[PDB]
Amino acid sequence: MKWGFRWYGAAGDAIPLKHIRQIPGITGVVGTLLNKLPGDVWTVAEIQALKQSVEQEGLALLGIESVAIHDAIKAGTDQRDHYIDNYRQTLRNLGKCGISLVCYSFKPIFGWAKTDLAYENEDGSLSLLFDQAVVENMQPEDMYQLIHSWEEERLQQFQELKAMYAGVTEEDLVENLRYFLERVIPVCEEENIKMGIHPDDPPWEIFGLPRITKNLADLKRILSLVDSPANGITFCTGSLGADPTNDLPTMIREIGHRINFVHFRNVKYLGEHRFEETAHPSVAGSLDMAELMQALVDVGYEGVIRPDHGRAIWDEKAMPGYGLYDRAMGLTYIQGLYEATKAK
Template identity: 50%
Template sequence: MKMTMRWFGSKYDTVTLRQIRQTAYVKGVISTLYGKMPGEVWSAAEIKSLKDEVEEAGLTLDGIESVNVSDAIKTAGEGRDKDIDAYIQTLENLGKNDIHMVCYNFMPVFDWTRTELARVRPDGSTVMAYSQKAVDAIDPEKMFDSIAGDMNGTVMPGWEPERMARIKDLFKMYEGITEDALFGNLKYFLEAIMPVCDKYDIKMAIHPDDPSWSVFGLPRIITSLPNIQRMMKMVDNPHNGVTFCAGSYGTNPENDLPAMIRALKGRIHFAHVRNLQFNDGRNDFEEAAHLSSDGSFDMNAIVRALYDIGFEGPIRPDHGRMIWGEKAMPGYGLYDRALGAAYICGLWEAIEKSEAEK
């Protein structure tokens, strides 16, 4: 595996490339052209500029998270083929710049859902959290307003103000879209882009829905092992794979995370490793430190499963706590993610050395 960290670019991120390099554990970043809208072509020159900036800081650009998929593609709406053509051109330009992994999602309306961005934990750190009771009590059109004050002046992925201003129209677009229809639209998209992925060896790593069940009645499909296997079977190409996000799949306690990893050998192109603490079954959860004992997941078992399948792709610590007075994009500060990277690397080294001693 290669330890990385998500970085949103110098214009948007409170964390610098210089700081990331000084962690010692992190050797590369997963980044994006954050100002780009879905359906917009990323030029080869823009991609090269981003890559050059990362490499000048002594790091590598190990993938993109995300090249956003437009709602027209997800709903088979007007302009779908035009947006797919733009996506293919972007992939072509990424391939020409020697970038071979793209994380993306196929979630309707909200890329992820949290009801709190700064829940205070017993140790005084703050974390993102989800309460089903809060979701059930809120007008979905007011969802952005309920969390906007806790974004610390940042623009969070999937919650861009321009997008949230269209929330009513977005819900209307997804009226009548069933899970089967969403699967069909994903199949259409994947079949269209696989030729350029084959040409440039670009691994498409779909991110799971977060949380892993329907929110506000919207369809969710990347939620469980059977659904992932359905997706891979309907477009059976090794470039059609997954981002294994422990935190997203883990929102449903019925998902056996190590078993899922082993079942997906060869198709996990990217890994997000993080921990959650459940407070009331699956109805109330909050982010935790990466440390196993701070949450509900056996992090050693998760890392062990990745090691056992021979995972060699990029891995990153995921949502961190806000600690030590840091003010940053919720989930994406420097300090706790650096601790997470160190912890994951420690687990990996221990497993690696124990295997070598056998």
């Protein structure tokens, strides 16, 4: 079990690396060149740089996340062939630098959605909240404006993608992910890398925009596109946990053999279709974590795992779910779960 911890590298991440390496148990981190944009090619030079700054503080670079999934490959445009080629190229670069894990997501226009991104709790901490009620009475562009902070120089940025993905049905997207996998997975194996796709949060349709990975249904389907251990899935218990109809345990046991990454974060049901992020321990939220930790051992999972967004606590300037405190605190609780559970 490689205890990981997301890090934005020596840039923007106000979290020094000499501090993360002081977390008890950490085995490494999961980085991502925030410079490059969707579609760019990651040069061995940049990858080597990142990996180095990490190993300097005696931390291993467990895998890179935020990857370049250009809208072309997703929508199904024609330029996708050039981007799927620039993607397989970086894939060769990552393998050349030893990287073996890549996390990615096939989401349409919104990489993430949240109505209230500063919800205060009883303990006086801030959290990200998503209320379906608010998503209804709000225009699709407003969400864009929100997750990208009057910005008119970005208005067309959204109005274009909308007109682009317009017409792309659910099954169409699955097919575009097929084309993508069929041309990136093969090289993954050559370079010896496992790709892990990030589920949708929330795990349900919003703004009539079709999303595939949101339940054991699609998950199973994702694995079918290309039957290969390289075509795996990261497990963000939180993201999927947001939908109470999603039996997290069974799932892990159902498709655990294909989990290459895992975001062990807890969520709280502050209402019907509305919910929030909270502390890792079960008492804090609505997800029985112990049970979840038991299900991972069952599938014999021993890969990289990292706590996900938590809360903005202890008077930190950082936006909730991006600071060191609650995340690091979360990283020790799960090891406590693991240890004991594994002690059987």
